[model samples]
Target chain A: VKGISNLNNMAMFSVSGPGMKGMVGMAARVFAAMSRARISVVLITQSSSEYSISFCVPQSDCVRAERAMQEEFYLELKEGLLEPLAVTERLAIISVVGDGMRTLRGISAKFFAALARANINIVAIAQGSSERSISVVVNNDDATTGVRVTHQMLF
Target chain B: PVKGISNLNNMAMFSVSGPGMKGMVGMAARVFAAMSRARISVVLITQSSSEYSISFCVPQSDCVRAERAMQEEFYLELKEGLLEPLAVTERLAIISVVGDGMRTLRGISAKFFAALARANINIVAIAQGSSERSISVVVNNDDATTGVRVTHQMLF
Candidate 1:
């Protein structure tokens, strides 16, 4: 059950800085604002060090998502505790998903290897504790190629 | 082409999760940095979404030291619940499949899962590097052999 889904009109927003990781309530605050703005977050990935956090939202809601973040961290932004937000659009979320992923090992390696062989560049990668899937963000131009190459490798 | 499955016993998955986690920078660095300072090797890591939480594995032998180091690092935050009390799940085996094919393929995971389900193996935690070269899952130490045997049968 691994495949690629076109994340049509999707956008990614990133927030980062020093001491932001220990501030507590940083993520909740941003998410709360996005929720209130009615922006749906489809995928999220943050650096292991927590220096930065990024979330993918519907492209239509990108403006609202960035606005929400601006409002939520206004004080921190002013104080330099947070950096100005960065956003990327025209992206697709390519995932290899399966309940079986819970017990099987090496699923990700095979996935990336396929993408490599296909000469696709992966911009961002994310996988949760659920182990249900591994998701990567690629440019829209590579969406179909990512899918076909992934399909050929694993399916 | 996953070569085969191997069981790493006496392991623990240490978890730190919370909604307040997103937008925080260097949180994992503080955690793992402590581990590194203590000379503990983290075997695996998994983090999903901005909803926020990170889980990593270290040998059960290092669990106590790892926990203590993390606790001391965030003593005030833990007390205030800014960070959840660290969680340690012990007495587990890390079952991993090594292969470069995982990154490219799709349904291999489905096959791996079906085999484990048939054998009634329950997985506790899982991790795969971005390279997609390997995948590792945690299961009860008792289930390691059966998990490996059945997965090998299905995959190889």
Candidate 2:
């Protein structure tokens, strides 16, 4: 790992229901309301089954995001197409960045091991094989501990 | 990623999966290595969970190459029936509506889905824009024209 970067003041939201699998518009409605409200989603991941979508947005934007969801996807919610949105606040996004990171094997295991040794809790993780970084989300309280250990391990 | 509709035709989607795939090291590595040695470009991968099975997108012409590689790599596991069918579909299409300001544009993602929703077509997969600038939805070759027109009609 070349270096570690962290972004604080991040918020997370996850929406899932039985109907998420059959629906065609979850992402559409999300991208719709989000763009219409002019709020950008920072990190996003979805299941191939389409049963759920978990994403992060700026901490201060939760109110607008949730309200807009009600405005846009409320009808779908009423029909049991989705569950109430769950928002987790006070988060940190810790990114592990480097050059040709993918070519180096065992870095991921080492990174996770460092966190596990620190007994840190990971909220969400995203690693794009096409990209040169791995990012993990953890609670705000554990952010520093997580990064310190990971940086030490990788460096 | 720039604006407008583009379709990748003659691609194949291959799904190889089972609960046994979870916690096993090198499953993905082996799969990719097999494809890599065969000189195939895996367009994308989508999975609901580690144990839920993973799907790979490749060029239609390489479906046989991918199929053979999987068979050679995991011949016993596949024959044991622990995993689902090593399945591949031919002549698929990925219709995408992309723009530079995808996140800035209003209801762009909605418009694309709304169009497909109207067509009564179901989506099997999507290619995500890491920066939230593009959206690609997969459909059958038969429905490629309808999907594109539907998506175009809504957003354009």
Candidate 3:
């Protein structure tokens, strides 16, 4: 009834621009396109140079939507660009909901320990403000590995 | 001609399947939470996929928060094997139909599918961004058509 499986998603992108600011524009362009699509975009962050824009979409639109984006943005990059850049990882972004999530303690430590025990790397994390939710981003290639580890933590 | 706008909305694109569902939902919810915290307007959505996938966007300020939230929430669950998910970090381009007040949310009854034809952007996936006033599209990178034509028509 309760577990991490209900918590996250991840995506990697092959992006480049004259500079980070230019990259942001590209990122913004893509975000706008996604918004128009109505695919429910959540996390959008860029790398040090903004060259690589990594983000997450809802699980419901994973397969078809991914392809759709590729057809629009990456298809050309696959043929051109720095070297067909695309990586698959299970970025399960889990967060705590409900009004009393803040009162809940040890949530972060427990979550981290769970990933550590499974040998899964915590590629990134965003926790601040209130305890409303704690989101986690993982590697898609490690889907099986990630899930197995998460299940252990919850059950 | 203009180009597609990649702003924060429910029109993001991704590649996730059955196993990726739970993780995708988790990320979306967390992003939503982050946006709410920042007092940013946000809408969330998901489309079932054959393979695992998920994508999202938040206000510029909230990007950092969303990213951190994602790293914190499900890093371990991903390791558990409870619901095998996938993180597809592949290069992609997206095209979407957006309008503050337009019709035809889900019917493409045109002769040549003019949207795809005029822009010449190959469509790989299509969905409705959360606002319910737009249509999301994923296009290939080589064909990042100028958004002028479509954007103007839709928005105007």
Candidate 4:
């Protein structure tokens, strides 16, 4: 790990639904709405099969973010394309940026191994295709521990 | 960990994706729910974080059954225009590469990409999981022996 940083006062929200009808435009609508609402998203991770598009924003912006997505996809929510926005607060995001990620194999392996020994359970992990950094979500209480464990890998 | 390519089996590739399906969620849940409800085995899965497409492998024998099951399960999404028609590519095989700490590493992908390029086999998909200590790839069924034989060179 090249560096470690912890972002506090974060909240995570997941947009999922009972089914996929009218889903094609759902994610775009979400960001569009967030943009219009001037709420910023700090991290986003939408995993395999579009199971759910989970993301994080400043805890202060949590309510506005939810309202943004809710209002943007409202038609689809009732149309059966979306589930109610799910929110989890008292969360923090930890980020590890590595040039090592581009040139090294097993970066996540070492990184995750460290987190595990420290007994940190991450809620989500997202890495850009450029291999810039990996940002993980953890409970607010553990963000400090997360920073120490990952930084230890630097030494 | 089982070292090197331990199992090579024929499987069918099924891909579901579309624009309308991007940010909305739970399409995958409904997909696998339909599969297990029918007891079909899902051998492999490869998906990007974009949420634009989802791809997985099933036993070749279960291709038609899996296809029909998925179709039945997502009929509404298809008709409602939230998803494109399902894509089922048959005559494919899954190559399992294993070794110590291989499950979450990166070099294996370079090996398969180049080996398959040499064999001129169209590379279909790849997946890795901690559920077991191996990485899996899907490629055209024919010439799989040479494909494996080419990659099989790595053990030395």
Put down candidate 3 lDDT per residue, B47-101, tens digits, no spaces. Answer: 2221223343223344445445544555565566533453332233444444333
Instruction: Tell me the tens digit of each residue's lDDT in model 4 across B13-32.
Output: 78888777655444544565
Could you arrange the candidates by TM-score from highest to lowest?
A: 2, 1, 4, 3
TM-score of chain A of each: 0.90, 0.92, 0.55, 0.90
TM-score of chain A of 1: 0.90
* Candidates 3 and 4, the one with greater DockQ: 4
Model 3 Cα lDDT, one tens digit per residue, A26-52: 444455455556655544333221234
Looking at model 3, give its docking quality level.
Answer: incorrect
Instruction: Name the regions of candidate 3 deviating beyond 4 angstroms.
Output: A1-20, A47-51, A58-91, A97-106, A128-131, A139-155, B1-156
Share of true Cα-Cα contacts across chains kept by each model: 0.05, 0.15, 0.00, 0.03
Find the 10 residues in a row with the least total lDDT in model 4 chain A. Answer: A100-109
lDDT of 1: 0.65
Q: Categorize the docking of model 1.
A: incorrect
Off by over 4 Å in 4: A18-22, B1-156
Give the Å shift of residue A71 in candidate 2: 6.3
Cα lDDT tens digits, model 4, A21-101, are: 233434445555666676655655444443466667789998888887777777878887776777889988776655632
Worst 10 residues of 3 chain A by lDDT: A124-133
Task: List lDDT for all candidates, in order.
Answer: 0.65, 0.67, 0.41, 0.62
Order of models, best DockQ first: 2, 1, 4, 3
**Could you give candidate 2's per-residue lDDT for residues A1-155 as a string of tens digits?**
66788878888777777777776666666777788788876655453454466667888998998898788878778987788877889988777666753432355446656776787756655543334455666789998888898888888
Interface Cα RMSD in Å, per prediction = 12.2, 5.8, 12.4, 13.7
